[PDB]
Nucleic acid binder design. Structure first.
Lengths: 154, 96
RNA sequence: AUAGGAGGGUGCGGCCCGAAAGGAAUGAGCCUCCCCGAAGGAAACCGCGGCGACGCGGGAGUACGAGGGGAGGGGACCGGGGUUGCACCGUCCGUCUUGAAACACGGGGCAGGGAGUUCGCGGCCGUGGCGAGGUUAAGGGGGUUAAGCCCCGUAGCCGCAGGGAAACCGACAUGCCCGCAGCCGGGCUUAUGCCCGGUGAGGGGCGGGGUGCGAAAGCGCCCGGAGUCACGGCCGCGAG
RNA sequence: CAGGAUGGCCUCCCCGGAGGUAGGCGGUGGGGUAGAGCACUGAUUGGAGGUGCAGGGGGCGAAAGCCCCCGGCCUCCUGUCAAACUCCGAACCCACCGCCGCCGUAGAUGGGGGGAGUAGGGUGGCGGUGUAAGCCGUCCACCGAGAGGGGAACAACCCAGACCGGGGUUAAGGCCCCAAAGUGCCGGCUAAGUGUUACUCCAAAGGGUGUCCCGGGCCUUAGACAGGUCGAGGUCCGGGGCCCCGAAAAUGGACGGGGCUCAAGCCGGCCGCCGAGACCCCGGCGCACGGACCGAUUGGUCCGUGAUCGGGUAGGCGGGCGUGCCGGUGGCGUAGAAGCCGGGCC
RNA sequence: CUCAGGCGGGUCAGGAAUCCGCCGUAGAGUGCAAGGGCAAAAGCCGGCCUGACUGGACCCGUAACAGAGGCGGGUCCAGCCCCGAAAGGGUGGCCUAGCGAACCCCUGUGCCUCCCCGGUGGGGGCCAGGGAUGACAGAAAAGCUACCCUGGGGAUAACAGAGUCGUCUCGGGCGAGAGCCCAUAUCGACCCCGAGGCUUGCUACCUCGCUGUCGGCUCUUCCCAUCCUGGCCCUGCAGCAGGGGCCAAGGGUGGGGGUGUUCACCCAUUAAAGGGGAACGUGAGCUGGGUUUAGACCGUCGUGAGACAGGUCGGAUGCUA
RNA sequence: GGUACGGCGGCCAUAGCGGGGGGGCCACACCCGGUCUCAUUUCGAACCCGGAAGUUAAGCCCCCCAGCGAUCCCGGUUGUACUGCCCUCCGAGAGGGGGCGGGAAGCCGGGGACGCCGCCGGCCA
């Protein structure tokens, strides 16, 4: 499946291994989101950097909304229905559905960058950024509940 | 008190041998052969004192770059520089 | 003359000055009206869930929103400056030090003066001339108000052949293999572009050669032509 | 040994062309730490059994010797150990391979050249030492060389890494007043102003029919305990939460202060709101890289990419501002030059 | 060929002399510390020998990563050899310690060379071995300063502050034991848990371009772990008195001898003649007896200059707020 | 192709130690004698030379065991001891704790285990 990963903690008091892991995950700043595969390598990277990120499974509807709102092309240009139809012949909803189902990867939209720069959540995070989501914080594996966070951050 | 590094410095357990492994080893390791470009581990045999590499390198994997006499030439990467060692095959092991 | 912080910072309000150099009667502060609008973003009202704080769906992505435009009214101020009031913040400057507001050192005020300079040798780089050659020193001749200007001056220095303590001997103007740029042929490709094949200056790896040690093998150094002069700059050693 | 040199770490330029590896997954190998254990070495309480074994006390002697306590050695049972022990043994770390991820033809890895500064470190976790403070190493996280928002102030703790003008939302944490946001909601506890302290920067052994609970044994609702008569739960034991005693200091005074008792304290949870230069959006500046144009020497204009550019001490590199004199070029001035006081504009 | 140690047997012979069997994973040995390695051996016993040699190449360690003179080690080529039937082994000791630059000198061995040329005596040069610097990456090397001077350091001691509380003062837990019986009227062994910062010590955090020492006099103030004064409780409290404890810091806590003394000792009174903090309160308030310069004497030590937390005599105290 | 036959080996105890039963086509042994080859720091004990009168008693070969030793699997102790990363979580302190990721040693009980492979010959066929 496809996993959405959001960086939570900042860039200070982070040791070199985790810093490099996050850099390779392309989460250079806070409130940044990426979509990755569910392969063992990526799972190991998430396990390594689990104390500064949260992640979960993303629905087709949430992926489509994220692409339409925060999806940006090279040059920080908006992703438009005209452009998506021209370069794929399908709507953003069908593109997201196919991506989630695994028919093809986001990389098949030309000039689309892998990073979504989300907005701070409405009402803030419902837990401290120093404890895992299971305990009641905001870090660690979140499951399907990451869709609510994605909605609150667009 | 600072102590300089010697050949057998702090090797009491590294160069020790199992009580049930005493005596000379089987001859297969003695008579094994390698080819240029092969990768070989370095596992020192305490009972054979000739052609022994420095225990500093015990447990590392190197590349065979030739063979002079009965000893194989193993090229290893210490830090960033390249080091050449001459090791009897009894101390070497193939990488599967 | 009831008020506390290194004497300042951000924002504005009193009082005062505002001819020129700043805007402005070809119209200032100001007042009224219309349009678009990013991130963001209500409420009235109605239905439902929770013991409760409250929340969910419609209202609605509506009202509003940085900023971007248009129209009408009025008719002389806005910008700027001095001082002071209020709200919040702010424990001076240079210095050694792990650590300076420091009960660590140097600090009454103002004006002038004040601290990587010159030569010799060596290593580099930026640029320019000539180029298997480069360059003159001392000095000489012409001309001139003059020490400027013009011409000569091969002594010398470095480079052209390296090895060796010395005696002494004394080498590729290319015999092969990879190969970047570039060029040529083909395919994909709207074009830049990508892939493949050949050739490939420069660059790299072999082969062969000179010399020292060696009985020899074999090793060290060197060999298929780029150096020299000049101006400026950085550093090294010696001179204070 | 308050000083130098060679390295490590920084900066600037060049060549050389197709790979590289801080993180992850699997695999091929190495290890002897934590823990554990007695199989080696060395310790360690008692009981049983067997051994004259050159112990030692005695009985027992012309000599040859035996009869018991006690010492030693061996086996078993029982109760304990090891930084300089190991029959075993992790987490974890290291080398090499294949792949994912990231960087690289806008030139990495790597190589040559020029210039440095650095030879007192501190806090924080771990290891050896020390009564402790501390001393000495190790980890590279923060200060040194670091803004802004908080913990009352604080170097190190929390959020957070910063070009300029604006709008919004969050972070640490906070919401009775100082002070922006709740005298917010549900169940329970404390009566001590205990507390109102994340850490920097908070006193114990022992004890409490003080209270709120959870387990277990005896009796066990007119049958239990207190005084064979009453007539409903009694009598014990081990535990959990809060509080109490144990608890004495010197200028007058510290939960930051006022103050607070179904809290404005504490335990288990929840619902709103407030709050940064962080994150999002709009406009502007510069820098890095690539591209197209014009200027007769280092220069100028515009376009494209930047989530993967914008703090900074020692130090390295680039551009620019200002002063005296000289060779040129173009000029100003007694209708008022230089200089000097106040003011406007870039 | 197999060791140490042990069991059973045997004339002298015994615990132990030399011998015969069985068991025996090394419990022996391996030149020397320790670790590692060694059983038809690397140990014990013998035969032969001198590879503990000559001319060279490359590589690892000292010195990881990451630079190095000198040195040690490893893998090899060639020459001449040793053992062995052969393979195979030999460049010292089974591996890790036992050692050292420049200049100069000595020895070996063959060559090159010395100013116009040649011979001779002698010298110079290349290669190899050797003589040492233990402060061991290599000076040739004794002291006092109180007559001292200079540049610095709070990178570093003494007084004072700060941290700590081993030590010191004080308190608590259990209760063996002593108390005619009775652990708790009184004392409280062995052991264990704490407070203070009033003794000493430890650390080296601030202060060395100066924060002027001990004691005494003067003066102000504060704490209670209370000596007297006020009020109480237990008692092995008859009274008069004693022992222990509690509340209580308003008041008092004095005068003298020797000694610089703080302190401690002593005297006569007294209700008692308590202990402590304030830069060990108080020198821009005082005094200067001691400490601690420059002069001098004695004892001891030193060859001497001289020194002594050993004595003794003398030895400066700045001020216009 | 058969063989209670040997020689050379690989892993080097799950293969060892200690026990019980069975065998001698060939073959392996014990065994007989020391002129010669060879040797005793004496010894034909070992080593060597010459053979088959006798024996399967021993070695050797085949089958069996769980007494000692070794080691493999399953269950319990047990996700116990220990440990990597984050933490404004609890403690006066020592030290503990929450989330994610690893995970023993010894002991108890039940099975396994008295070796498995390679090459070539002898005898028979």
């Amino acid at each position: 499946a496809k996993l959405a990963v959001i960086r939570i903690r900042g860039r200070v008091n982070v040791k070199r291994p985790v810093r490099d892991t996050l850099a390779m995950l392309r989460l250079h700043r806070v409130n940044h989101c990426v979509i990755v595969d569910d392969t063992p390598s990526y799972l190991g990277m998430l396990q390594k950097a689990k104390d500064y990120i949260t992640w979960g499974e993303i629905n087709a509807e949430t992926l489509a909304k994220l692409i339409r709102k925060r999806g940006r092309l090279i040059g920080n240009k908006p992703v438009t229905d005209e452009y998506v139809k021209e370069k794929l012949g399908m709507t953003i909803e069908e593109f997201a559905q196919k991506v989630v189902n695994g028919e093809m990867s986001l990389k098949d939209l030309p000039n689309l960058k892998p990073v979504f720069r989300l907005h701070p959540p409405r009402g803030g995070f419902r837990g401290s950024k120093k404890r895992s989501f299971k305990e009641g914080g905001a870090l660690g594996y979140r499951g399907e509940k990451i869709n609510e966070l994605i909605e609150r951050m667009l | 008190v600072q102590k300089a590094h010697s050949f057998r410095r702090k090797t009491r357990k590294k160069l020790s041998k199992h009580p049930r492994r005493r005596g000379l080893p089987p001859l297969t390791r003695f008579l094994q052969e390698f080819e240029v470009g092969q990768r070989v581990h370095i596992v020192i045999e305490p009972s054979y004192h000739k052609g022994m590499p420095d225990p500093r390198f015990h447990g590392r994997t190197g590349t065979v770059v030739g063979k002079r006499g009965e000893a194989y030439i193993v090229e290893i990467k210490d830090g960033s520089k390249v080091k050449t060692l001459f090791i009897h095959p009894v101390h070497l092991r193939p990488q599967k």
